[PDB]
């Protein structure tokens, strides 16, 4: 719960003025997920309280410096009858490191359908990523050993230091380490953050290269997400990820996030650079 | 051919300044704006870098009677990647924003999923064929033809073969603008299929919110391409679709994603 509380406090941004916020970093380059979560927070502050995020698109232009604050500038694009759109610019040292555009909608009942949650083993029968990691050794990028803000339980373990040729699919159960506030928006920031884990490295699976192995350049180029339905992150959710394609030194992943009842919560898409040097 | 020739010209934009372009319209079709925006951005990019991705939002309906201005901001020029943001302007307002990324063609890891098992395009009737039982710039051979005024409960999947009605230039950039244009056809309406409602039914409000695409691989639009569309979701008066585009040999060439308004008045 301390890990979780630290993260939540980090995604609760400092207000500088209307649509100008300042966020601190985890410190331990900055994690894509932190920027995403903070960007969502920033944009949501500028939108009517009722209109909650339903989608965003982002490009990652530069690494963030984890030792320095990030400013989030929020541009008002349009407030229509239903939709409010915003562009978040994340700025450090006078340069943009990341842009997000996001769209918020007034709740309303409408047409309802969804695909099916893939058939996988429940989380009660799986080890956590931090338990499996102990065995491995390490670089000193050790977000694998400490207590984590989010518990990850993979259906199949993928050693970041040693790949094995595998199908380009990954399934991971996950959940906030602590009880969350009763406030959908905070669950949304956290989910955006969480959605950048166990994602892009899926594209390496057929090639049998672990994402931390020496000389492997892996970096996110873009990250987009769609919040289909409400959810809570203090109960188990499943991230189903496939990499439908790699080419041109790039790797492409799509994800779908389901609650334990099988409800389709969110969908994600990301392309990154995947280059063995 | 004729209709194809006028589309291609209408995607070759009038240059007003560096990063400012004017495009004629054919309300506007989403694909036109998309395809035009891609031209705009590509003009401001180093020669060798071709588009590998873009994201867009639709803010306002585009008036088809008037032209559209495409303003382009230069966002970054990196070691390999260049990024630009296009604003499409009409009546002094933004109707649409796209950010797009361009990269050098480079050799890397290769894999792809597998093209759906569908009837080949050679046996299939074109949509103009079906119409009797004017010329379109792109020939469409649907696996299953839908009636925009009559829906019936169908699975949230749709498969359409398509091709450029005419011989195209040996210029990947043009094939890309055109694929951009094409990607907005036989897409968002797939979301209505589980609901037995055609998109052109009375009281059906259907409008693109966002449209994003990834150009995984080179291709030609003057040979047959399959658009494989699913709607994995619909909720809160929106509908969500994902698309994948394969060439006739099963090569995955592009992916797409759009969310849209779908509301019954
Ligand atoms: C945007 C991105 C694709 C950069 O692309 P690029 O500058 O064209 O980089 P390339 O793919 O050619 O990178 C290769 C080189 O760039 C260098 N590089 C890294 N950051 C750089 C920067 N800001 N400017 C210039 N070069 C950079 C690397 O050291 C690497 O060395 P190499 O040429 O020997 O391989 C990507 O690498 C990136 O930086 N993404 C953002 C990072 C991120 O996730 N940030 C999270 C916080 S927002
Ligand atoms: Na602002």
Residue numbers in the entry:
A (entry chain A): 2 to 29, 33 to 140, 145 to 285
B (entry chain B): 2 to 27, 33 to 139, 154 to 285
What does the paper say about this structure?
Acyl-CoA thioesterases catalyse the hydrolysis of the thioester bonds present within a wide range of acyl-CoA substrates, releasing free CoASH and the corresponding fatty-acyl conjugate. The TesB-type thioesterases are members of the TE4 thioesterase family, one of 25 thioesterase enzyme families characterized to date, and contain two fused hotdog domains in both prokaryote and eukaryote homologues. The TesB acyl-CoA thioesterase from Y. pestis (YpTesB) is a 288-amino-acid protein and is a homologue of the human HIV Nef-binding protein ACOT8, sharing ∼40% amino-acid sequence identity. The TesB monomer is comprised of two hotdog domains arranged in a double-hotdog fold similar to TE4 and TE6 thioesterase family members.
Since the previously determined EcTesB structure contained a lipid molecule of similar chain length to C8, we set out to determine the CoA binding site of TesB enzymes to assess whether the lipid-bound moiety could be a basis for modelling the octanoyl-CoA binding site. Crystals of CoA-bound YpTesB diffracted to 2.2 Å resolution, revealing the same quaternary arrangement of domains as the apo form with density for two CoA molecules. CoA binding also provided additional density for the flexible loop regions that are missing in the apo YpTesB structure. Interestingly, only two of a possible four identical CoA binding sites contained CoA. Interestingly, this double-hotdog protomer in YpTesB associates into a tetramer both in the crystal and in solution as determined across a range of biophysical assays.
